[PDB]
């Protein structure tokens, strides 16, 4: 048959398989099953994204920071959320020295779309 090949890293955050939206914490907990599993949710009211990843048996929450027109958490940043997430998935740098958590694979919304 066939398949396609493109620069998916530039895809808008709104279509990212790991962008479940402003969903509550109970829903989030049912997505991450293993260490390295990650997703992005939007904050309640306030327009700020939150990366949630599982490690050691505790789903962590990392409020994404934005300042230099780029988003980051402990090291470098990028002009967009997917660009940064893709980079950690690429270079395997830890999310924060204080925890040492790394991203191994994204968790999809469900078989509904993607």
UniProtKB/Swiss-Prot annotation:
What functional role does this protein have? Tyrosine-protein kinase that acts downstream of cell surface receptors and plays a role in the regulation of the actin cytoskeleton, microtubule assembly, cell attachment and cell spreading. Plays a role in FCER1 (high affinity immunoglobulin epsilon receptor)-mediated signaling in mast cells. Acts down-stream of the activated FCER1 receptor and the mast/stem cell growth factor receptor KIT. Plays a role in the regulation of mast cell degranulation. Plays a role in the regulation of cell differentiation and promotes neurite outgrowth in response to NGF signaling.
Q: What tissues is it present in?
A: Widely expressed. Detected in adult colon epithelium (at protein level). Expressed in melanocytes (at protein level).
The record makes one more remark, namely:
Cellular homolog of retroviral oncogenes. In contrast to the viral oncoproteins, the kinase activity of cellular FSP/FES is tightly regulated, and the kinase is inactive in normal cells in the absence of activating stimuli.
Q: Which residues form the signal peptide?
A: none
Modification note: Phosphorylated by LYN in response to FCER1 activation. Phosphorylated by HCK.
Q: What is the effect of changing residue 21 to V?
A: Abolishes kinase activity
Q: How does it assemble?
A: Homooligomer. Interacts with BCR. Interacts (when activated, via coiled coil domain) with TRIM28. Interacts (via SH2 domain) with phosphorylated EZR, MS4A2/FCER1B and HCLS1/HS1. Interacts with phosphorylated KIT. Interacts with FLT3. Interacts (via F-BAR domain) with soluble tubulin. Interacts (via SH2 domain) with microtubules.
Q: Where in the cell is it found?
A: Cytoplasm, Cytosol; Cytoplasm, Cytoskeleton; Cell membrane; Cytoplasmic vesicle
Domain of life, per lineage: Eukaryota
Q: What is this protein called?
A: Tyrosine-protein kinase Fes/Fps
Please tell me the disease that this Swiss-Prot or TrEMBL record associates with the protein.
Has been shown to act as proto-oncogene in some types of cancer, possibly due to abnormal activation of the kinase. Has been shown to act as tumor suppressor in other types of cancer. Expressed and present as activated kinase in a subset of acute myeloid leukemia patients; promotes survival of leukemia cells. Expression is absent in K562 leukemia cells; ectopic expression of FSP/FES restores myeloid differentiation. May function as tumor suppressor in colorectal cancer; expression is reduced or absent in samples from some colon cancer patients.
Membrane spanning segments where? none
Q: What is known of its domains?
A: The coiled coil domains are important for regulating the kinase activity. They mediate homooligomerization and probably also interaction with other proteins.
Domain SH2 residues, every copy: 18-107
Please give the family membership noted in the entry. Belongs to the protein kinase superfamily. Tyr protein kinase family. Fes/fps subfamily.
């Amino acid at each position: 048959g066939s398949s396609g090949s493109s620069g998916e890293v530039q895809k808008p955050l709104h279509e990212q398989l790991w962008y479940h939206g402003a969903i509550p914490r109970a829903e989030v907990a049912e997505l991450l099953v293993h260490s390295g599993d990650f997703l992005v949710r939007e904050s309640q009211g306030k327009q700020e994204y939150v990366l949630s990843v599982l490690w050691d048996g505790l789903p962590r929450h990392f409020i994404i920071q934005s300042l230099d027109n780029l988003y980051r958490l402990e090291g470098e940043g990028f002009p967009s959320i997917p660009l940064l997430i893709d980079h950690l998935l690429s270079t395997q740098q830890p999310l924060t020295k204080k925890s040492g958590v790394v991203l191994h694979r994204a968790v999809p919304s469900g078989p509904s779309s993607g």
